[PDB]
Design a protein around this nucleic acid. Structure first.
Lengths: 142, 142
DNA sequence: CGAGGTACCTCA
DNA sequence: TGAGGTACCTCG
C-alpha cells in the first residue's frame, strides 16, 4: 500500500528492472513491496534517448525498453529488499555501485508492471496509496 | 511625429530633463523633436529608488522626480540636437560623458512632459506616431 | 517593440 | 509532490 514517486524515464526503468537501484538522500526502514508512480514531470525526448543509450551499454545491446514513459501515473512496483548507505552499497554491490552515488540506495528486486496505468498525484518520500487505486493496482498485476 | 521607446524609469527621467542623454548601439540622423514613449516593461520599486538615489547624487539632493513612472504610454518629447559617437561624446561633453558608455549618444535638450499620458505600443528604433495620437500629444503640450 | 511559450522558483 | 506565479527567451 506504499508508494514512491520517481521522475521518468527512470520510473519506468525501475518497474522494468533495467534500473536496479534508486538513490535518495534519506533513509527508509520500509521493506517489501513498494509501488512506483511517475511524477508529473515529463522527460524530453533527448532525455529518453540519451538515457536509453546508457542502459544499453550497461545492460546489453538488445535490452527491451518500454515504448512509452508516461507521467503522473501508477506504473507498477518493486520489492525494496534493503536501504543501504553509500558505504554499504559500495561493499555489497561492487558491480553496480557506480549506478548511484546517493547517500542512501534502495535495492530493488522483482519489478512488476501494470499493463493499465492509473492517473495519480504523488507526495514526497514514501506515501500511502488510497485503497481504491490500491485494489485496482493489485488486480492489474495478474 | 517621430518617437523613441525607452524603459522606465529612464523614460520619464528623460522627459523631466534629469536624464540628459540616451545611449544606443545605432546612429540616427534625426534631429529636432523626438517623442518619448515608455516601453511595456514595468520597473521594480528597487530600480526606481536605486536610480533616484544615483541622480540625486549627480544632480542635487532636492531634485524633483516624477511621482510615478508609467509603462506603455507617450510621456512627452525632447529635441534631439545631436547624435554623437562615444568618442565625440567624450570630447564635447566632458562633465557628463560618464553618464553613457554607448556607441552612439543622443544629446537631448528642451524636455517636455505631457500632463495626460496616452497608451501606446512602440517599435524598435525611431518610429512614427499615428496622426491621431500625435495631434493629441501636441495638444497636451499647451 | 510587444507578445506569449517555456523554464525556473517557491511553497502556515 | 504538484501547483502556479515569475522570469527568461525568442520572434517569415
Amino acid at each position: 500500500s506504499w508508494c514512491l514517486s520517481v521522475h521518468q524515464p527512470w520510473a519506468s526503468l525501475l518497474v522494468r528492472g533495467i534500473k536496479r537501484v534508486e538513490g535518495r538522500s534519506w533513509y527508509t526502514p520500509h521493506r517489501g513491496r513498494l509501488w512506483i508512480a511517475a511524477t508529473a514531470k515529463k522527460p524530453s525526448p533527448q532525455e529518453v534517448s540519451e538515457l536509453q543509450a546508457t542502459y544499453r551499454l550497461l545492460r546489453g545491446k538488445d535490452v527491451e525498453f518500454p515504448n512509452d514513459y508516461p507521467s503522473g501515473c501508477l506504473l507498477g512496483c518493486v520489492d525494496l529488499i534493503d536501504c543501504l548507505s553509500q558505504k554499504q552499497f559500495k561493499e555489497q554491490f561492487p558491480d553496480i555501485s557506480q549506478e548511484s552515488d546517493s547517500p542512501f540506495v534502495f535495492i530493488c528486486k522483482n519489478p512488476q508492471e501494470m499493463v493499465v496505468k492509473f492517473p495519480i498525484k504523488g507526495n514526497p518520500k514514501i506515501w500511502k496509496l488510497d485503497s481504491k487505486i490500491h485494489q485496482g493496482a493489485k488486480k492489474g498485476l495478474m
